[PDB]
Each structure stands twice: as structure tokens, then as C-alpha cells.
Design a protein around this ligand. Structure first.
Ligand SMILES: *[C@@H]1O[C@H](CO)[C@@H](O)[C@H](O)[C@H]1NC(C)=O
Ligand SMILES: *[C@@H]1O[C@H](CO)[C@@H](O)[C@H](O)[C@H]1NC(C)=O
Lengths: 99, 241, 327, 49, 49, 48
């Protein structure tokens, strides 16, 4: 709706958004994964909560930032400074939290 | 595998009259009891056709192709087997190959490096070339085959087509009329300026059997052709004789 | 009616007593028919498109196509070949147009580099692996090959030339493995500082994006020379129609007439028949070796006998040269 | 007779060429055949006289 | 299979060559007939002599 | 000249398909998209 392109189909078959269970141990920390070579994943132990919805919007903002600089070289495939990467994902949560 | 033969008995080129040989169907159209005039490459009547003798006579020279060739052979026991075709007659340019073994015929257009003295040797020893680099077309069909066999061939190269006309007649050149029917069409699209016959040598060294062949060149001229009721050519007249 | 047909020819509304010839009787035509010999000796498209293994982009292969009929409709009919961008010739007319030789070029590249396979384009594949001329008469076919060219551990069998001293010429293959000279110091055969191997292996895996999944690319190059065009498209055969006034196409000849059974004895090599008028009166069907007398649709002159319209209105019709058991 | 055209077969001219040039070729064929027919008619008239 | 969408879309890109650049084509047809003409070229009238 | 009625047809085609806009000319757009009559008076304008 805001103008960012929809994510690729590879995200669906490569990202696990639910806790695997007791048999498999997975990190529940909210982390966005830019593996490179056009591969983007988010490690999510998402629950049905408002925060996880805002956390998801905050973490897609990280990954959505990643496809933006995909054309730039790998060493330059980063934010201009350390503050930009988290800031661009925070406005996503701020806008999604509006009534 | 090349072996140079020095047992040749040198002889100056011979000649004989062509009489009324070399008439072939110029197209594939049926005509009945009509006199039709056509202009195409033809062997002029009563021309001076070269005579080559095989007997110790070993006539395997290289002749120019010009606009066309009329190949005739007074043959028995099938000493003649095939021909070579090309311009530089080596691996530099594309060359054409015609061979007829005891089973069938083999047609290949490759960058052959022919032997200086190509020939064939029961017959189970084929020694006619040394290499084959780029093969662009190959064709296989049925074999073409007292002096009892007369074989007459016509070779043409127009618009990249290699036409072959043949006629087998059971019998110097005899007096009569016999039209030559088309046999095979080859869409090769190369240029040919020289050729060389391939002969089969009998090993029991080697001895050459009783055979002879003639080479005549075609010219563009007008013939008036007479068709019978059944559609075959029975007589013709050379309009410039 | 014939009386009005007479008025129409005379360009008048009153007709004097006499006999007038107006028009002719040829049973009108009706259908359109085309016949060609049996479609055999199909070009080996399966051996290239359905090949078990495709070569690397730098070792891009040559497969010349000749002396066969090429059915471009079948290859286009395959659903997986979603990408089909064709250059210099309409895909529809490829089924009919003929060329001397067809060059089939096959290799494997990434999805993002598919756009580099085009005339006037640049890139690592364009400059170092495969350069395509601007005046390119032909076109390419590309499709996803993730299911075949990708392994979970990585399919490293496919390599691309990362570095070269100069851009490749059109239709030029460079398979040299000489160490690239990136600096002024000589390489001396050692891939050290400012010296690296020009070829890099693609690490294709099924867990990549759409732009990085392997894409098998088959490139078709078409050329026309003085040599005869021996690569033709398939020809459609229409069921035979006889004893009717039809338009026929037999091996490229056009005409109109009724096709009837013929008792003529053609020679085995002969195909066409001509009368003393030098007109095609007989023809041999390509599907079945039978001779069809191309009788002109029953044609005949007509003539109307009439008294003056000042006297009466009845007319009589004469068909000269026709036995009227046939009308 | 070709009468200066590329082909002596009218339908072959229609089929093998585009109509813009096939029309010119057919015009050449038609004028040639009309010339032949009028020559025949004129000679017939003289012979009839 | 054997069932395809006949409508294909031009994906015009500025990176494409001149062969694939978008071109705007305007087709003009004139009805030059015996009907009373309505489309007039730039001309000046004159008194009837 | 003075015309009775004038019609303007406008569309967008590829670069190499401009030659297919011609009377009696065959092609994909000619046969399936836009065909001009043979006895056609009038003419076309194309620009980049
Ligand atoms: C993304 O959007 C484009 C354009 O609407 C569409 O073609 C594509 O299928 C979409 N992809 C996904 C994964 O929704
Ligand atoms: C033509 O063929 C018939 C057989 O149908 C034969 O009797 C006749 O002799 C042939 N004509 C000639 C001139 O050989």
C-alpha cells in the first residue's frame, strides 16, 4: 500500500514463522536474515499478540531495506550508518500501531 | 593409407566420337507424342569425347569439372566403383565423395584429405583418403549397379544442387538412342571444379581388368526432344549441329 | 434467367430476333485444398531441449541443424518455456520460413542474466561468455531449471568467465583458462596478487531467489546463404477432394479445377503432366502416388435463341459441344 | 509466355508475391494476352477478307 | 496444454535496443469518393466566373 | 486535396514491426492485430 514491492516467493518456503516444537530447538529472538544472493528470511517464533504484529512489521522493515540495496555491491549492501537500518523498521511499527 | 603406383604405362590422351549420347530428361514433367524444345546443359552431338582405357593402363587422372560432366563406362565385372569431387581436393575445402560397395552406396561431403593415388581392392580394402574433419551431409541409397554393362552418368551443379542422371544398358561407343533418367538430387550447395574417378584393383601385385570409361563436358545448347505415346524420349536433334 | 443474361451482355433492354452467345458454363469452384508429402525426418529438437546435461556458459555448445524439417510450433507449445522473446522475425512465420542452417546454442546462466541475452546488450556473459550480434536473425528460449540444475549441497558443474582482456566477438567462444592479468606484475602462471582464474563456478542451489535460480537457455541462430535452404517447417495436409471444382496447392503450384481419376501412365520419376497446350492437365498427389487429371471445371460456351421481344418473350438455350446427359 | 513478368502462371504470381506487385505483374500478363488475342483477330480478319 | 492466452504484453524498457523501443503509430485514412467533401485543405475561394 | 471523411487510428507497436503496417503485408500484428486493406488510400505516421 505504501509503495514497497511485495516480497518474493522464496521467503515463504524458506522462513519459519511458527515455533517448530519440542523436538526441534530454534532461536526465538526476533532476527531478520539477509543471506545474500537474492535470499531473504526472517526467523520468527511469532505468537498471536499485538507486539508480534508490530515486531513483524519492525522486522520486515529490516528485510524490506535489504532488497532495496541488493543492486549495490556486497560490501556496500548495508545502511549508510548504523542507525538507518533499525530506524526504517521502526516507522513501520509506528504506522501499523495507529488506530 | 596412401600408396603411389609407378607401374603406369604412359600413353597420350585418346579421343572418340560421341555420336548421339548424353540425352537426359531436363525436368520431371510428363509429355506424350509431342515435340518439345528445351535449352539446358547438354553434351553436343558427335563431339570429341576423351577415351580412358583400363587394362598396363591405369587411367585415374584429375579432370576439370567445367559446367558439367558426362561420364560413360564400357564395363564388365564392375571395376568402377565411385568418384571424387571438389575444388582443391584436400582438407582445406569441402569435398564430395561417392562410393558404391557390394552392399549399397555411400555419399559424404566432408573435408577429406584424399590420397594422391586413391583406389580400392573379393573387395575388402578401402584406401581412398586419410582424414575427415567436418561432415555436413551424408546420404545412403541402393547400389547403382564380353562387355555387357554400359553405364552413363551426368553430373551437374546449378543453384547448389548436385543432380545425377543414370542409365544402364546391356551391350567403341555404340550407335543408338537412350535417354538418361534422374537418379538422386543432392542439396549440398558447394562449388566443384575438379573430380577424379575411383577404381577397384584386383589382387591375387595387382592387375587391371578389361574396362574403359569416357569423359565428356556439357555445354548450354538447344535440343528438340521427341516424346512417344508412353512419355519417354526416343529421339532428339541438336539445333546447332 | 437466360433472357435477362442476354440483355445484360448486349447492354440493352430490347433484343432483336437471332441467336446470341452470352456467357459460359463452368461448375463453379467450392473448396480449397493443399497436399504435401508425409511429414518425416523431424529436426532433432528433443536432443537439445530435452538434453540430460547442458554445458557451461563459457563452454557454450554448437549443434548445427540441417537436412530436416523443423517444427517450431511443438517447441513453443511446451508450457515451461514461459520466456520467449524473439528477434528479427515473427514467431508465427517461423513455421513457414526456411533457412540454410540452424544453430542450436545451449548453456546455463542465472535468472538475472537472462536479460543480457539480447542484441546490443552488455554484461559479463555478453562480453566474456557469449556475445550476440546486433543484426541477429534468430532468437532464444529460456526456462527455469531449478529442478534439474540445482542441488541442496550446490551444483558447481556450471562455470562462467568472470574476467577477460577484451569483449567477445559475435558468435565467439572463449574457453581459455589462462590466469587473468589484473595488474602490471606478470602472473607467471600463479593465481596470486592481481592474478586470478578468469572462470568462476556458479553455486546453484534450489533455495535461491527467482533471479538466481538456474535458467537453461537455448539459442537459435538462423542463416540464409547461397546454399539451398534445407531447413523447412511442417506443411499441413488437407483431405483429398475429387470430382469437384476446387482450388489446389500441390507442392507449391496454385490453380483451380476439378480433380478426377486419371488413366495416364506416368514414369516413376515424373510428377507433372502437360498437354499439347503446355498447360498442367495432370498432377501426381504427394500423399498417395496417384495421377489426378486436372480437368478444368466442366466449361462450355452458351448461346440463347430468341425472337424479338417485340414479338414474344420465350427463349431457347444452346450448349455447344456438350452432350446434355451431362447437364 | 511470361510477357516480361516473373512467372507465366497467374495464381503462382498471386501466391508467391505481395498483391501490390502481383497486381502489376498480372497487369503485364493481361495486356500481353490481350495483345496476342487482338493480333490473332486482326490476322483472322485479313484472311477472312 | 495446447491452450494459451492469445494476448501477450509488450514489456517496454529503456534499456532495450531500437528494435524493441516503443513506437507510436498514427494511421490516417482518406475517403476520397464522390460524396460531398467535408474536410477542406487550406485554400481561398474566388468569385464565380 | 479535399476529403469527405478522415479517420485517425493510433496505437503503439514494437520497433521492428513498423514495416508490418502496410497494405498486403503479412505478420503477427498484420494478420492478428491490425490489417490494412489493399485498395487503401491514406497513410501512416510513426515516431519514437
Ligand atoms: C507480487 O506482485 C506482482 C505484481 O502484482 C505479481 O506478479 C507477483 O505474482 C506477486 N508475488 C507474490 C509472491 O505475491
Ligand atoms: C508404349 O507402351 C505400350 C504398353 O502400354 C507398348 O505396347 C508400346 O510398345 C509402347 N510404345 C513404345 C514406342 O515402345
Amino acid at each position: 500500500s505504501v509503495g514497497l514491492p511485495n516480497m518474493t516467493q522464496g521467503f515463504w518456503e524458506n522462513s519459519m514463522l511458527t515455533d517448530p516444537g519440542n523436538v526441534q530447538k530454534a532461536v526465538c529472538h526476533p532476527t531478520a536474515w539477509d543471506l545474500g544472493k537474492g535470499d531473504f528470511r526472517i526467523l520468527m517464533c511469532t505468537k498471536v499478540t499485538m507486539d508480534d504484529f508490530l515486531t513483524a512489521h519492525h522486522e520486515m522493515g529490516h528485510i524490506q531495506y535489504d532488497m532495496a540495496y541488493a543492486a549495490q555491491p556486497f560490501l556496500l549492501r548495508n545502511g549508510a550508518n548504523e542507525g538507518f537500518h533499525e530506524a526504517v523498521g521502526e516507522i513501520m511499527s509506528l504506522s501499523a500501531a495507529t488506530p | 593409407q596412401c600408396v603411389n603406383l609407378t607401374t603406369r604405362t604412359q600413353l597420350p590422351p585418346a579421343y572418340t566420337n560421341s555420336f548421339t549420347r548424353g540425352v537426359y530428361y531436363p525436368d520431371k514433367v510428363f509429355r506424350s507424342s509431342v515435340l518439345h524444345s528445351t535449352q539446358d546443359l547438354f553434351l553436343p552431338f558427335f563431339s570429341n569425347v576423351t577415351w580412358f582405357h583400363v587394362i598396363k593402363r591405369f587411367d585415374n587422372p584429375v579432370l576439370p569439372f567445367n559446367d558439367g560432366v558426362y561420364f560413360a563406362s564400357i564395363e564388365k565385372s564392375n571395376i568402377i566403383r565411385g568418384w571424387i569431387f571438389g575444388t582443391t581436393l584436400d582438407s582445406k575445402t569441402q569435398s564430395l565423395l561417392i562410393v558404391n560397395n557390394a552392399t549399397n552406396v555411400v555419399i559424404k561431403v566432408c573435408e577429406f584429405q584424399f590420397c594422391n593415388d586413391p583406389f580400392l581392392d573379393m573387395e575388402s580394402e578401402f584406401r581412398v583418403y586419410s582424414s575427415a574433419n567436418n561432415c555436413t551431409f551424408e546420404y545412403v541409397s541402393q547400389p547403382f549397379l564380353n562387355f555387357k554393362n554400359l553405364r552413363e552418368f551426368v553430373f551437374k551443379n546449378i543453384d547448389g544442387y548436385f543432380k545425377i542422371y543414370s542409365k544402364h544398358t546391356p551391350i567403341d561407343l555404340p550407335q543408338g538412342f537412350s535417354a538418361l533418367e534422374p537418379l538422386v538430387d543432392l542439396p549440398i550447395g558447394i562449388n566443384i571444379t575438379r573430380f577424379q574417378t575411383l577404381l577397384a584393383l584386383h589382387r591375387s601385385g595387382w592387375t587391371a581388368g578389361a574396362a574403359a570409361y569416357y569423359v565428356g563436358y556439357l555445354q548450354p545448347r538447344t535440343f528438340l526432344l521427341k516424346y512417344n505415346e508412353n512419355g519417354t524420349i526416343t529421339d532428339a536433334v541438336d539445333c546447332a549441329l | 434467367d437466360p433472357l435477362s443474361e442476354t440483355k445484360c451482355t448486349l447492354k440493352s433492354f430490347t433484343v432483336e430476333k437471332g441467336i446470341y452467345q452470352t456467357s459460359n458454363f463452368r461448375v463453379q469452384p467450392t473448396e480449397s485444398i493443399v497436399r504435401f508429402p508425409n511429414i518425416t525426418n523431424l529436426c532433432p529438437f528433443d536432443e537439445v531441449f530435452n538434453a540430460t546435461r547442458f554445458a557451461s556458459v563459457y563452454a557454450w555448445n554448437r549443434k548445427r541443424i540441417s537436412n530436416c524439417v523443423a517444427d517450431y510450433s511443438v517447441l513453443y507449445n511446451l508450457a515451461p518455456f514461459f520466456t520467449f522473446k524473439c528477434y528479427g522475425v515473427s514467431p508465427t512465420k517461423l513455421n513457414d520460413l526456411c533457412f540454410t542452417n540452424v544453430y542450436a546454442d545451449s548453456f546455463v546462466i542465472r535468472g538475472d542474466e537472462v536479460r543480457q541475452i539480447a542484441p546490443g546488450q552488455t554484461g559479463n556473459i555478453a562480453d566474456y561468455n557469449y556475445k550476440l550480434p546486433d543484426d541477429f536473425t534468430g532468437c532464444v528460449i529460456a526456462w527455469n531449471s531449478n529442478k534439474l540444475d540445482s542441488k541442496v549441497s550446490g551444483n558447481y558443474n556450471y562455470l562462467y568467465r568472470l574476467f577477460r582482456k577484451s569483449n567477445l566477438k559475435p558468435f565467439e567462444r572463449d574457453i581459455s583458462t589462462e590466469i587473468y592479468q589484473a595488474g602490471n606484475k606478470p602472473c607467471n602462471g600463479v593465481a596470486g596478487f592481481n592474478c586470478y582464474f578468469p572462470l568462476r563456478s556458479y553455486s546453484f542451489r534450489p533455495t535461491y531467489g527467482v533471479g538466481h535460480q538456474p535458467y537453461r537457455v537455448v539459442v537459435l541462430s538462423f542463416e540464409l546463404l547461397h546454399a539451398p535452404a534445407t531447413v523447412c517447417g511442417p506443411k499441413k495436409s488437407t483431405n483429398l477432394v475429387k470430382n469437384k471444382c476446387v482450388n489446389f496447392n500441390f507442392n507449391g503450384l496454385k490453380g483451380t479445377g476439378v480433380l478426377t481419376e486419371s488413366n495416364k501412365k506416368f514414369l516413376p520419376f515424373q510428377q507433372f503432366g502437360r498437354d499439347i497446350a503446355d498447360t498442367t492437365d495432370a498432377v501426381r498427389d504427394p500423399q498417395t502416388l496417384e495421377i489426378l487429371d486436372i480437368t478444368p471445371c466442366s466449361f462450355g460456351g452458351v448461346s440463347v435463341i430468341t425472337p424479338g421481344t417485340n414479338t414474344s418473350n420465350q427463349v431457347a438455350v444452346l450448349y455447344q459441344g456438350v452432350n446434355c446427359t451431362e447437364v | 509466355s511470361k510477357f516480361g513478368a516473373i512467372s507465366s502462371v497467374l495464381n503462382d504470381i498471386f501466391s508467391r508475391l505481395d498483391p501490390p506487385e502481383a497486381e502489376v505483374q498480372i497487369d503485364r500478363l493481361i495486356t500481353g494476352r490481350l495483345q496476342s488475342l487482338q493480333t490473332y483477330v486482326t490476322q483472322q480478319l485479313i484472311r477472312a477478307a
